[PDB]
C-alpha cells in the first residue's frame, strides 16, 4: 500500500481536503490516483509541483 512516487501532476480541493494526482514510479499513467495530502510522504515532489 505504500509506493514510490514519481511526480505530483495535479492538485485539487474536494470535500474539505487537498488531494494530489500522483504518477507512481515504475507504473503506467493509467495507474495514477488522487490521494489526500495525509497520504503523501513526498514533500519535494509537492514542492516541484508548486513551482
Amino acid at each position: 500500500e505504500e509506493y514510490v512516487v514519481e511526480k505530483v501532476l495535479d492538485r485539487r480541493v474536494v470535500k474539505g481536503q487537498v488531494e494530489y494526482l500522483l504518477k507512481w514510479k515504475g507504473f503506467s499513467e493509467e495507474h495514477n490516483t488522487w490521494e489526500p495530502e495525509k497520504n503523501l510522504d513526498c514533500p519535494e515532489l509537492i514542492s516541484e509541483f508548486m513551482k
Binding site: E2, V5, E35
Partner: peptide, 10 residues
C-alpha cells in the same frame, strides 16, 4: 537512511 519519495495509495 537514504530518503525516498513515497505515498500510501487509498
Amino acid at each position: 537512511a537514504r530518503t525516498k519519495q513515497t505515498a500510501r495509495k487509498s
